[model samples]
Target: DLGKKLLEAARAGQDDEVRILMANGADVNAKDKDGYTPLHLAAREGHLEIVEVLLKAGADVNAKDKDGYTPLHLAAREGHLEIVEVLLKAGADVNAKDKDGYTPLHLAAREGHLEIVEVLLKAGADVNAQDKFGKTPFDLAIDNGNEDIAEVLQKAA
Candidate 1:
């Protein structure tokens, strides 16, 4: 129950409840049936403090969901800049791929998160990574009409 409560708190951005649950021995790496840890929910939902709390409690930064999406992927895809920075600082793999081979760079680029793309590039995200469809982050950015992101990727490569 504590694990579920922690997930809920993290998803809802309830900073105090998340802290209390972790203090009460909630498993920091606990995942629901979907394999989404509290960190995943927090990162996806842009809960910056909850993400920091979970990471401080030893939450796995690279923990994957059923689709192989680490917290970094969700944070990048969701445009949570601070969460992305925290996850990267906590050692989230910049080049980690999901089931479709979509890295955080791909997600950020596809989502038109120019700032996130810049950060990912600075953190050494693979500029030439190909997804299952053989599309690079640049391809996705261009496909999605994210001209700024595509320009950044082009410069990085």
Candidate 2:
């Protein structure tokens, strides 16, 4: 019950509800049917407040969903720069890959998130990392016409 409610509140960005649930013994790392934990929901939805609340209670910052996407991957993929920073600060894996072998940097570059791309690079992401299709972050950036990200990757090389 607590787990369900916690995930529900997290997905809705209800920080107070999440807090109460966690305080009441909700499993901070509990995953739903799709393997989404409260941390994943909070980070993916840009709920920094809820994210902190969960993380403070020992939520798995690097937890991966069924799709193999960690909170960092979701944050970067969704262009949530601050959330990405927060996850990274909480020890989220900078080079975590999804089911397709796409790292957070790859997701950021593919989605044209220049700031996230820069942040991931500065955090020591594998600049030469390749995805399932053998596409590097630079390749994805270039393919998406994200010159800023491509340039960043170019310089990082």
Candidate 3:
């Protein structure tokens, strides 16, 4: 399917191919087998330009995958600060949780993305949001020994 091909292109960081597909009438919001949209793949893989193109083509900024991971979740989890900013600016849900109830902040913090954590915080992501295991971003920061992130989470709270 064109949608799956687009997903593959976006996942492979082929921005030109993504743009070509979009120009050829491919659905920007089309989901793959795992329910991941082009925006999700682009954001997860840190392809900022691809993300922008998808968003401009009317991609659903908050579309969730099979496990409930939004573009914001993947961007933050992969420590893509610029992509996270782009998603946030596109109105992606900063507090979106995955199947495990993990918010973008949780993923950013757990992955030790201090800058991404700060970006999420400045965008008003819930500083105290907890996951299904009842662990907050602060807890993840502490657990990961990300004192810088933990301090930021602390100040936001």
By lDDT, who's the top model here? 1
Candidate 2 Cα outliers beyond 4 Å, as residue runs: none
Clash totals for all models, in order? Answer: 0, 0, 0
Q: What is the per-residue lDDT of model 2 for residues 17-120, given as tens digits with 9 covering 90 to 100?
A: 98888888999999899999999998899999998888889999989888999999989988889889988888989998889999999999999998999889
RMSD of each: 0.6, 0.7, 0.9
Candidate closer to the true structure by lDDT (higher is better), 2 or 3 = 2
> Per-residue error at 139 for model 2, in Å?
0.4
Q: What is the TM-score (0 to 1) of candidate 3? A: 0.97
Error of 1 at 136 (Å): 0.2
Model 3 C-alpha lDDT per residue in residues 1-157, reported as the tens digit of each score: 6798899999899988998888999988898788999988888889989999999989999999999999999999999898999889989898998999999999999999988988888888998788989999999999988999888888889
Candidate 1's C-alpha lDDT?
Answer: 0.93
TM per prediction: 0.98, 0.98, 0.97
Sort all candidates by lDDT, best to worst. Answer: 1, 2, 3
lDDT of 1 at 136: 99
Off by over 4 Å in 1: none
